[PDB]
Design a protein around this ligand. Structure first.
Ligand SMILES: O=C(N[C@@H]1[C@@H](OP(=O)(O)O)[C@H](OP(=O)(O)O)[C@H](OP(=O)(O)O)[C@H](OP(=O)(O)O)[C@H]1OP(=O)(O)O)C(F)(F)P(=O)(O)O
Ligand SMILES: Nc1ncnc2c1ncn2[C@@H]1O[C@H](COP(=O)(O)OP(=O)(O)NP(=O)(O)O)[C@@H](O)[C@H]1O
Ligand SMILES: [Mg+2]
Ligand SMILES: [Mg+2]
Ligand SMILES: [Mg+2]
Ligand SMILES: [Mg+2]
Length: 317
């Protein structure tokens, strides 16, 4: 049997989408799935981790990426989602630099780095209705993102013409994704990316790749609006249908290969007749789509078979 190893925190490994997809991958005649126990990932040295021929491994809060990297170096499996790139995906400055190198449209932005060892002072000038970051002017409205991609405390600053103040986004807490603050002054501690506000129809497009030639998209209400989460009868966030255009399918192809993440979530802003990438999240499954479960398991199983069938001497056409 070809062994597919799943290496992630239990919250991910035991998620509904993961269980649905692993059950379908196991339907492949020559594939066996081994899900690495969280206790083993955290507390056992990598030399005691299970063997696999193909490794599906991804960082989330609490995951020891250093260990996953050492395991891949030790055992040299076929890696679906590159582990070294998952360090860069944690840093919005590294994400944006990769997108730029790939000729991918993204909001105009500037980085404000505050050295806490070298705070003689910042390169930031603030007016009522704009900031200047290393000389570059952002008129309100503009967006302020922590450089840490794991920190979801993204602020939007409104112009005087629209009543001033700010919208403070955060990781969903039940009914809410953002709240208005009367505060008009930017944050004075930390490092941030400042970017131009892209005007959408009030929705974000979420894109989910399975290799560079498959991308499911769906839309949700922007947290940049009032911050009230729309939930269905079953208490799941309301999703709106999306079909990607030819330009957007090319963006998905580029993001998947540039970040070396077979399974990759990213966000698109449909604005000014174009589509801008504002976030790359790495490993992410579509939630509550049976057809996605079917398609994702079939593509990942076929990738494994195409890559490893020859050295296993298994017929594959
Ligand atoms: O907010 C939710 N789930 C989110 C995950 O949070 P966890 O439940 O895993 O903590 C989050 O994971 P982290 O970034 O917090 O680790 C990530 O799920 P992912 O691991 O599949 O990426 C994210 O999706 P993205 O933001 O798209 O990465 C999910 O949000 P939903 O897409 O709303 O389910 C929710 F509470 F489950 P819902 O019931 O509101 O969907
Ligand atoms: N330049 C922008 N213009 C307009 N809206 C933006 C912009 N950047 C971000 N947003 C909005 O703010 C939301 C959060 O920004 P995003 O960079 O996706 O944050 P995050 O903290 O990485 N979220 P997540 O998708 O869960 O990882 C987006 O979904 C948009 O609705
Ligand atoms: Mg099987
Ligand atoms: Mg994540
Ligand atoms: Mg996002
Ligand atoms: Mg993100």
């Amino acid at each position: 049997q070809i062994v597919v190893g799943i290496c992630s925190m239990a919250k991910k490994s035991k998620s509904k989408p993961m269980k649905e997809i692993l059950e379908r991958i196991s339907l492949f005649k020559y594939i066996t799935v081994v899900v690495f126990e969280e206790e083993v990932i955290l507390n056992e040295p990598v030399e005691n981790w299970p063997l696999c021929d193909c490794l599906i491994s991804f960082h989330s809060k609490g995951f020891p990426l250093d260990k996953a990297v050492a395991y891949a170096k030790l055992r040299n499996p076929f890696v679906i989602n590159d582990l070294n790139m998952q360090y860069l995906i944690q840093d919005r400055r590294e994400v944006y630099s990769i997108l730029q190198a790939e000729g991918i449209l993204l909001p105009r932005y500037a980085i404000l780095n505050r050295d806490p060892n070298n705070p003689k002072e910042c390169n930031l000038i603030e007016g009522e209705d704009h900031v200047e970051v290393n000389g570059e002017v952002f008129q309100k409205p503009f967006v302020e993102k922590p450089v840490s991609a794991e920190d979801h405390n993204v602020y939007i600053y409104y112009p005087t013409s629209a009543g001033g103040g700010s919208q403070r986004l955060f990781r969903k807490i039940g009914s809410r994704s953002s709240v208005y603050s009367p505060e008009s002054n930017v944050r004075k501690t930390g490092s941030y990316i400042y970017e131009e506000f892209m005007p959408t129809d009030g929705t974000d497009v979420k894109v989910y790749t399975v290799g560079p030639d498959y991308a499911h998209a769906e839309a949700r209400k922007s947290p940049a609006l009032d911050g009230k989460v729309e939930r269905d009868s079953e208490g799941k966030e309301v999703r709106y249908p999306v079909i990607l255009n030819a330009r957007e399918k090319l963006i998905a192809w580029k993001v998947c290969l540039a970040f070396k993440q077979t399974v990759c979530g990213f966000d698109l802003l449909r604005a000014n007749g174009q589509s801008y990438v504002c976030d790359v999240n790495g490993f992410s499954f579509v939630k509550n789509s049976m057809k996605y479960y079917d398609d994702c398991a079939k593509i990942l199983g076929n990738i494994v078979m195409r890559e490893l069938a020859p050295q296993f001497h298994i017929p594959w056409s």
